[PDB]
Point group: C4
Chain length 161, copies 4
């Protein structure tokens, strides 16, 4: 069944959570197994209400694909990347919701700012959660993501006994 062991970062204005969603497989009728829906690294952002307390119900999600992960783990100190996602893509509700994840170095080079933006043209809202991430914390993600990458790709199945 499910497993809940997210790496989390709690800061002044918002919280960040990251955990792997494994790929789904389909047992073929040839006997073997085929990778079906792809795994990701899910990112959850949510706001801090009141004093050191976080409103879990106003949360927004961002699914990192294998390639977006590779883009992140290969980031240099002075590098920055930005990903743009439409949840309801190739679907009926396209163009309506627009997510954009940005990773930028801060002035000091003492880390990055990781912010999620969500623009919903249906509900007429504009949300933005930003979380500062230190070098040590981003080292955690880098390493944890690297480790997780083969698994979300399904490559952990290629095992000798």
């Amino acid at each position: 069944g499910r497993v809940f062991a997210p790496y989390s970062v709690f800061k002044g204005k918002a919280a960040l959570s990251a955990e792997p969603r494994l790929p789904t497989f389909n047992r073929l009728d040839s006997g073997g197994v085929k990778l079906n829906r792809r795994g990701v690294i899910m990112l959850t952002f949510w706001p801090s209400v009141g004093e050191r307390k976080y409103d879990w119900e106003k949360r927004q999600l961002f699914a990192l694909s294998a390639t977006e992960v590779g883009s992140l783990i290969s980031m240099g100190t002075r590098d920055s990347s930005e990903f743009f996602h439409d949840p309801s893509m190739l679907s009926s509700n396209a163009g309506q919701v627009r997510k954009s994840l940005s990773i930028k170095p801060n002035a000091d080079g003492s880390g990055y700012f990781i912010s999620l933006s969500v623009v919903n043209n249906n509900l007429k809202t504009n949300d933005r959660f930003t979380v500062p991430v230190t070098t040590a914390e981003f080292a955690v993600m880098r390493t944890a993501f690297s480790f997780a990458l083969p698994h979300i790709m399904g490559w952990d199945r290629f095992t000798n006994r």
Copy 2:
């Protein structure tokens, strides 16, 4: 049985697929186990027919050995490597078919071009599939290959319980 979870890259003129083929073992009569045929990282190239559609039947293969993998994961941004293979080697049909895989950085340093060339003197054909690969994508291969390397070498068997 078999497992199908290839990392794939689909571009304008062709598609690239990479997946590990595990080594085969032979149970000795001493009780232990001996590595027999070696594992590789198989690369499959195939052409794009019509509009965003790929002719799976005109595909060519290239098997990366452990050492060729190590050559790839240790490539710098400005580096390039070229591998040359004869499928029917030390065999009757040698010199007939000639494969050459090249990995070159593009001008921008924004990635590499990965091309497969196949020259068949029997069928009198000359094929060449090239796929551009971004930094993020090549980061995926680098990481996925690194992870896979111990497995195709059989070293995943050396495990404490």
Copy 3:
């Protein structure tokens, strides 16, 4: 049950031991599993009495969290980090005991000094164990810690079969 395979470094004035403490989980009533208490990399320091012999009973501990680990594995040759811990935190006995772990490069760049300081205002004691660590040894920790990081985070549970 428990497992005892610490990486150890024995030097002139003191000994250093490092081993992973895995996270604890709670099986939810939803069926799945939830990470409970977090894993760490435990560091044990203890003094050398007499000639090449070490007083196991005067030992002090320091628990590295995931983020402190990431801080360590991302250290450059010329880098240094210092962690400050209060064992009895958010508790009744706070402010009483104070631990500080320092990792500093030595002049030669031939490694680091890893020292633990413990100031106990209850028992009125002031302890300090320092252990020199070569590049090769610190390479061992770096690698061993990197490997261990996903496990103490609970991410080794995200596995395809």
Copy 4:
């Protein structure tokens, strides 16, 4: 039982083989498990007799400890390391046999020379096998050794389920 999957390099004058020997454990009477004898990365050198053929019976061994491994995987392009071993150490036959492993970059920086020297004062012999190693091959060892390091340390036992 035993497992035989060595990474091997065959060159003009000699052959090199590398494979992990796992640590031995002792089940305590407390229930848990304790690491006993330490694992290593065994290196086997042997001479080439005649034309492309190798005299398996004149082979010499060198056991890499965890720390020696860390020294090797942290080697730069222009770096070189030398290890010195006495097989019959803290024993009756000490000082008699003397092994020295050297890893040096070649002029081109196109790899290293890995040579084993064995001086036996009992049998009055002086042996020396050298094997050139390319960047790609040394990348294989680096990666394969890194992967193996946690295992020979016993850290592969710290696993969540």
